[PDB]
Amino acid sequence: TLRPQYFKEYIGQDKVKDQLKIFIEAAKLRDEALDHTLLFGPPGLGKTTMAFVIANEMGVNLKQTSGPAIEKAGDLVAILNDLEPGDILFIDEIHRMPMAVEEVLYSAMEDYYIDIMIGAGETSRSVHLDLPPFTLVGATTRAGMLSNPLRARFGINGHMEYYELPDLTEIVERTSEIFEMTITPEAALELARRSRGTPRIANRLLKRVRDYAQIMGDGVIDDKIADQALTMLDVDHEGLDYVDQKILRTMIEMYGGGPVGLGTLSVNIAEERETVEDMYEPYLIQKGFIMRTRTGRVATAKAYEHMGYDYTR
């Protein structure tokens, strides 16, 4: 299924999925809510969908908000009253919350009550607001900016990872059934290999292949048509675009692998400095095709054998 409701249905993320099962069952064997949880990983892996599944597994309702939407302590406190005993609160981009509210957030998390102080300071009085037990689930991409007191409150940590070919192939198959098209497993494997491990990219390729298969063919995505469609678009079998191939070729052919400066490479391919550094260069590093050094970029042996050129130190 594309929209899941239980861990039995959620594709991939087996590591985090197996761990959460145990913690949820141990929580059910007691009159306790799930511990405060924090989810890590690159963007676009499904951190939000995971929250909906945890809520259904717990048998509880889900409240949703985002870090920027909270501007003052009153905003958070108002939301906290909406939570019923055991409710789950999901805060996206929790690292964007303001410091002024951080003091209130972890206090309630630990004590389940809030103390308010009023008066000039010389004479002051407090009021105590009891809160029902609840579970906070935070999602973030940047962790090094979370304060140490906040980090210490979260008792469970989950790391999201890029999907592998055996799992990413099933997403294509399931998505291919929402539309009215038949796809051979060998064709599905070819698309997954070029999806860079991201579901959103796999869907985009499938949509573009569908258009070709129903205008230049019989409306069926066979292995022969997939090769033609993947040839009109220049996406290489490793997922390199036309510009990515031009970048690697230029470094080897004209500079002998480097070192070469960012400015010198930009003027050769006719692109802006910001475009090569933020669009194309990031993926080439993950695949290990290039490295960044004090004196410029340099190509690795892995790039030579992929492009098909002999290598020498």
Partner: peptide
Amino acid sequence: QEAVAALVALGYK
């Protein structure tokens, strides 16, 4: 007055 003052302490005008 306490409730109003407490609400003001939360940053409300």
